């Protein structure tokens, strides 16, 4: 399966915008079937974004209208956050599910720490 490639951490500016990269090289046989982004919520995680066969779903009021996950370049499922909040400092998980020719599904994920600085 494709390696999910992410930086270890990303730093953005308070009230600015930032991208958290999550990219894999497409690989013959492996069809992407689900993408999720999750954020830590105390001692577990919660979904903040899902892309599936019916498109993108961002259903929390705190996120709807300010998250964009890349969609035009195969393998690029990077998350961009509009107007960073100090409380956006957190660990974010990029999670991708692929299907193989035999119908097997492989799921991989990666945790990226997001830091938020008050000024540039």
């Amino acid at each position: 399966h494709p390696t999910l490639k992410t930086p270890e951490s990303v730093t953005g500016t308070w009230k600015g915008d930032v991208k958290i990269q999550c990219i894999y090289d497409p690989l013959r046989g492996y069809r992407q079937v689900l993408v999720k982004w999750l954020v830590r919520h105390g001692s577990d995680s919660v979904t903040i974004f899902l892309r599936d066969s019916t498109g993108d779903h961002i259903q929390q009021a705190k996120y709807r209208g300010r998250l964009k996950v890349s969609h035009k370049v195969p393998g690029d499922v990077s998350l961009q956050i509009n107007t960073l909040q100090m409380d956006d400092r957190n660990h974010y998980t990029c999670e991708v599910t692929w299907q193989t020719p035999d119908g097997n599904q492989v799921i991989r994920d990666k945790i990226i720490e997001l830091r938020v600085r008050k000024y540039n």
Partner: nanobody, 125 residues
Framework: QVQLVESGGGLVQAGGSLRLSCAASGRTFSSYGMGWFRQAPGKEREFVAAIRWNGGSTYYADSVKGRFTISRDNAKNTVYLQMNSLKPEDTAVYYC??????????????????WGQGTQVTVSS
């Protein structure tokens, strides 16, 4: 660059129990899923057990299911492997590893970034 150091290895009799630990350096321990792997003489390195960043999900190789339990203390930057009902075939060098997987892939060595030097465990009979 996180450094990992295993402790607690040694000689134990078959049927006995042994507790390994692994200390991680730094202030970002909770950024990592942690795992134990082992490598016996002549054999390739294989998965033993893993534990999610939160200490709340664990994963085991079929070879050690039930007998071995992995745990972590994020306040101490430490992961533990409690090995019960030991068998001579559990003899190996045991390696601690850290990676940025969350819930998935923990049985695969390529999902880990950093490795300890390993500690010898010998189970005699």
């Amino acid at each position: 660059q996180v450094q990992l150091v295993e402790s607690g290895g040694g000689l134990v009799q078959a049927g006995g129990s042994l507790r390994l630990s692994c200390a991680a350096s730094g202030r970002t321990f909770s950024s990592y899923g942690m795992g134990w792997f082992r490598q016996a003489p002549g054999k390739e390195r294989e998965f033993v057990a893993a534990i999610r960043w939160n200490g709340g999900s664990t994963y085991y190789a079929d070879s050690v299911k039930g007998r071995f339990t992995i745990s972590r203390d994020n306040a101490k930057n430490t992961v533990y492997l409690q090995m019960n009902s030991l068998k001579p075939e559990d003899t190996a060098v045991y390696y601690c590893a850290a990676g940025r997987w969350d819930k998935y892939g923990s049985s695969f060595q390529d999902e880990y970034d950093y490795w300890g030097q390993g500690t010898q465990v010998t189970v005699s009979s």
